Amino acid sequence: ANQIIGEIGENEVRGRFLTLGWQFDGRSRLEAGIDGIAEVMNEGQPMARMIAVQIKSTKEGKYTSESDTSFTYLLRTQDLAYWRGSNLPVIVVFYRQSDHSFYWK
Amino acid sequence: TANQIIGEIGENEVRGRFLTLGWQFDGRSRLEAGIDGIAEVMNEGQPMARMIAVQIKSTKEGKYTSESDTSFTYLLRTQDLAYWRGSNLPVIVVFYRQSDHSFYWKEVSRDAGPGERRLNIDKVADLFNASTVNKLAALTVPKTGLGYYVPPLGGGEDALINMLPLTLPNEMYIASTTYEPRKAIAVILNGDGPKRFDWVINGGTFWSFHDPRTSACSEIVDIDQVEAINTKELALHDDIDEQNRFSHLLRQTLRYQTDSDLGWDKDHKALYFRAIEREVSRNFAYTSSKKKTDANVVSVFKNSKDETRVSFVRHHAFSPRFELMADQWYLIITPTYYYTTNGYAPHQFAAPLLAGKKRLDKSAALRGQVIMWHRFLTQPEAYLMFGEPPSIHLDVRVPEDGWVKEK
Amino acid sequence: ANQIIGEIGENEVRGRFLTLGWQFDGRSRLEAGIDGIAEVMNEGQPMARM
Amino acid sequence: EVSRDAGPGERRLNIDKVADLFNASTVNKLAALTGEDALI
Amino acid sequence: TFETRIFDEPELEFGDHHHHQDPRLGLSEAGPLQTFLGDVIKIGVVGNSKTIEDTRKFIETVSSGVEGKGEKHPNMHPPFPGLGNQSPYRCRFEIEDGATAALTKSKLDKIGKEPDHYRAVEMAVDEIIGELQAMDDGGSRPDVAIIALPVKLLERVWNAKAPNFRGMLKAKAMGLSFPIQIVWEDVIDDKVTIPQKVKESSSRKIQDIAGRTWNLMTSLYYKGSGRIPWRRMPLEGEFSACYVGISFYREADGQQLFTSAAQMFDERGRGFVLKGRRARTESRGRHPYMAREDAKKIIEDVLAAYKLHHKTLPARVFILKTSRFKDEEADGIIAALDEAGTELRDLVWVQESYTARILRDGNYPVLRGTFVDLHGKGLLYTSGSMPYYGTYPGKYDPNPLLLCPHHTSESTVAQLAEEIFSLTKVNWNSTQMNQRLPIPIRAARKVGEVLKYVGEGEVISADYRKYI
Amino acid sequence: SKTIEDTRKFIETVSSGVEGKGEKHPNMHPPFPGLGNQSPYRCRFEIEDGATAALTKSKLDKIGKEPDHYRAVEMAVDEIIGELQAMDDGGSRPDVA
Amino acid sequence: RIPWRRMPLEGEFSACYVGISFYREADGQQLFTSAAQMFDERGRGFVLKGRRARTESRGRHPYMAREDAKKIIEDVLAAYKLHHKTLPARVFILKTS
Amino acid sequence: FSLTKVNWNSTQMNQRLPIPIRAARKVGEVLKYVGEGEVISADYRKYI
RNA sequence: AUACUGCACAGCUGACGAU
DNA sequence: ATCGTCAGCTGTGCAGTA
DNA sequence: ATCGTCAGCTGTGCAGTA
Ligand SMILES: [Mg+2]
Ligand SMILES: [Mg+2]
């Protein structure tokens, strides 16, 4: 059940991304950590070269210490050391099933 | 450009619409131009090894060929039809609308049958969504049907229940009585003023909810003061005969105090709708807001050819019972008809008249009958206040959305 | 490295399928047992056989 | 390949190394589915 | 709000350990649970010369694939596969040339003058049993018997104008090796303008020529071979249980009332056993309620019949009775139980009405098995809409049978509801799916309906093959 | 029996997230996140069917009939201990009872 | 969890298998008795276990007496009846003496 | 003869003694050095 | 009477109490 | 002792096969 | 084996979860 919510969250986050362009590949099933590679569209032509994006989807339910204005997320230092040693910026998003709260960090 | 990108975002959104009820849409390379990835039907964590071939067109924005909210008289080509018939898997047609992000599918296969020009009548009730998904399950299984089938595809729908909860009044009144019931009916019948009969008398005491000097006189009751007891202390130790006496109390309460006072049948049970005048129609449209008012209550049915003779007139009837289901009451309904030839003289052939419509087809009006009957009774003192039955939740639905309606 | 050998085995199976000109397209890891879909063509005859 | 005959399934598939090859020879086979005397 | 559960449809065991919820499909796909050694069944027949011959052509013609009522909805009336090389029973059935009975046409008009009807049923059934005994005396014994009655011999024995039929002739036939099977000519002939008794109508419309042969043959196969068609499966963790059910039948005229009972349990290998009891069930009272003695006797009998076969004692006892569970006999039941030593106990009562009539949103009625717990009284819908069929077999107002367990029982009501839902289509009569009243009370009704007029001598055969 | 069914229902309900008490003092009542991917244990609990002890009503009736206070609690404790010991000796050993 | 077990036949009665064997005391010349009490589970399993007791010596003989043989069978029957909720129909005893 | 290869300490089919005799002998071998007053377990894994 | 479904109708049962 | 209230409990006939 | 003085440590139970 929780395995399909991540796939549908990735699919609809990509649909939001492909909404205004933002060419997203996703990954295969061999991936670990970082999700697929995306770019930025410029009025109909991929002017942007490359960037990295990671999906993070959760079910219905509020986050930690979420009271109508904010919430908090904690990052594992293995993942932080993974992204710090890289050659591309990364972005982190959140869930989509309460009222489609696609956020960027 | 425009069309290719809007088509690929359309297939992304219908992949999501596949994914929102299971239905793992596994894609493929685009090297066929007319079939998308293969969908696999799934049932709540268990794949069912059933696959459907999908194909998706580009987009639909604004009005188009005979576009409407319900009709949508759109016609497709004929070159693609053979291309959509030279296949083994059931290929389904998919379109996408950006106005409300909806998805069009109203055709699967016809087995080499040129049905007009591929009419796509959509949004009559619902498009490819959570509702009516068993129309997609019964596709690879043909009408031959040796042993294979498909279970209902999850869903989850609410449903009503037919007992109305009751909120009884606060007080109850008892007194001493040294009389007989045959004297009581005599003084009720031969008395002068108006009278009611919302009381009962047991062998030892009194049992009512009225004054020491009632509106229906005070001869049967004693000269002593009646005693005021709250209704929350009533027969809760033993002796279900006391529950029977409370049942007769509430029986006379419902019999001699109702809305638009009716007659009380003894053929089926309890009450039934009367006739306002000598053999006339009886509709009484009423509603509890929403958008639909009541349709019918009592109609007059005539002979087929002998126009000068009336066949019969039928009314609606039900019978409440007495159940203290965990210290909370419930009035239980049974919608039935009662037949007469004039509205007052009882019918001598009422047995096969209950059948017919009970025999012809499915229910198709029992929900409406339950709704109008629960709204009918919820409208000096009334001595009663009624409520609303609960709606229970089920994990399963009938696949009649994917089936064929009765003709 | 079980995922590595599974992925290279799937790719080589697809390569041997396709070097004879036979379509084969894999699926995601949300399945259980159905590792892919194959449709057959010979000299450009791709009927919708599954 | 596994059949669809009536009854139980057919486990324990035995595979030879002569006619089960995935070369160009066996391409169209799966495309047709549509006593003794002793002493003491 | 009210709590509820749903149940998936239980399967039925068949040959090759095969489990399926559709007994026609399971029989046609994996054969019977216990196959027969020889491929022969010999069937007797009583009738005039016209019924024997077209019975022979019926037996011949059903062996080539008589199809159903229609192509639409192909699964309530499935195609009969025949009696050759693909049979559901894997055996052949035939009429031997030593059971070809006929009836005299001489003793009619003075019966038609009608001085008395009780003497008429007496002489007719005495002649029938005399012929059957004369058939069983010789070396042409059949496994079953067809007692297809002559039309004038029936029309003037049922509506003879207080008679009784279909079971009194069995009640004076517990002495023959073959268990009889009365078949009215309605499908055997399938053309005659049969009357409709009281209402002067055309005929009784029955069905097409697939399901009739299906369930008739199934009943004939069980009654003839002695092997059993189906049973429900045990579960990996199930204990040992016996099912007893009690019905409350009337007198031969209806002043006193007596209580009938049934019994069933599993087998040591792969089987199922369903018996009655070869004893009288006299009243010792007039009001329709149990006694200590009868309940203790039936409990001791089911315990003895289980220990005779399994060499152990069951871990569970299940009782389904149609009246209140009071301590005047519950003391005897409980005392007999710990006299034996059975640990799990259940005591369930039925027939409480006007309790719940739950509806749904749409057009069709509720599904098959929507169970609700009404704070102790569990109501379940043994009938309803039914998804593998694709249709709704039924007219209107499906009755939700409920379970009122006695407070002595050790289980929850939902578990017992699931267990009884697994115990609906297990009786060996017909192939119909919907069975509201469970088998332990169904068989009790089926034995009491022949015990209500004769128990005076000729003790019953508890093999159940003369009860369907 | 009823305790076992309510225990299974309790586990099934609390595995799917639990709401907070209210907005008044939110840190006093934080919501339980359930045993999903947001679980604060990185493991999940399951109740295998191969070992589950249902207590018969005859023994509970005998427990509720003894007038002596000491030996009734002692025999209830010992019976439970014997059920758990036979649970442990077999091949259906649980992690926690 | 057990790796494999023998296939039970169809139609056989329920039974429990008890071995018997003996051993020495590693300093003096005596003999004990010790054994296992295996049987079949209610589901799909096999129960192979010893007993939580040590028999006394009672002479230098590889034969027991009529005071612990009854106790051993009583323990086997109690261990079977606690799990299957009924007594078995057959008892199989294997001995080296 | 059916109760021969149930012994889980080995994997050969060349087994002579049946399982209960082997289990009893191994149980006795481990039980030889246990003093009085100690804890003995019914678990078979403590003996093989 | 292949059965098993509802409907309609009829009879019977027990739980309380009298001028 | 039959009339009311309330709960069963057990017998007989039609139809339509979706 | 009792009675005032002071100084402190375990059982047993009820509200209230602010
Ligand atoms: Mg070792
Ligand atoms: Mg029959």
Numbering used by the authors:
A (entry chain N): 7 to 111
B (entry chain F): 6 to 384, 397 to 424
C (entry chain J): 7 to 56
D (entry chain J): 112 to 145, 161 to 166
E (entry chain E): 2 to 162, 179 to 485
F (entry chain M): 50 to 146
G (entry chain I): 244 to 340
H (entry chain I): 438 to 485
From the paper:
The short Argonaute-based bacterial defense system, SPARDA (Short Prokaryotic Argonaute and DNase/RNase-APAZ), utilizes guide RNA to target invading complementary DNA and exhibits collateral nuclease activity, leading to cell death or dormancy. In this study, we investigated the SPARDA system from Novosphingopyxis baekryungensis (NbaSPARDA) and discovered an unexpected filament configuration upon target DNA binding, which strongly correlated with collateral nuclease activity. Based on these structures, NbaAgo is divided into a MID domain (amino acid (aa) 12–50) and a PIWI domain (aa 250–485), while DREN-APAZ is divided into a DREN domain (aa 1–146), a bridging loop (aa 146–161), and an APAZ domain (aa 161–442). Collectively, these experimental results led to a detailed working model of NbaSPARDA that highlights the importance of the transition in assembly form during the activation process. gRNA loading, tDNA engagement, and guide–target heteroduplex propagation lead to the “monomer-dimer-monomer-filament” transition of SPARDA complex.
As shown in the representative cryo-EM images, the average length of the active complex filament is 91.61 nm, containing ~32 copies of the NbaSPARDA–guide–target complex. The filament is composed of a backbone and an inner layer. The backbone is constituted by NbaAgo proteins, with the APAZ domains and guide–target heteroduplexes positioned at the periphery of the backbone. The filamentous backbone is formed in an open-ended domain swapping manner, and the intermolecular interactions occur at the MID–MID, PIWI–PIWI, and MID–PIWI interfaces in an asymmetric manner. At the PIWI–PIWI interface, K324.1 forms charged interaction with E360.2, R287.1 forms charged interaction with E253.2, and R285.2 forms cation–π interaction with F256.1 and polar contact with the main chain of G254.1. Propagation of the guide–target heteroduplex leads to a dramatic conformational rearrangement around the PIWI domain, particularly the “sensor loop” (aa 280–307), which is pushed outward in the active complex to form the PIWI–PIWI interface that is required for filament formation. Notably, group alanine substitution of interacting residues at the PIWI–PIWI interface disrupted filament formation, abolished collateral nuclease activity, and eliminated the defense against invading DNA as revealed by bacteriophage infection and plasmid interference assays.
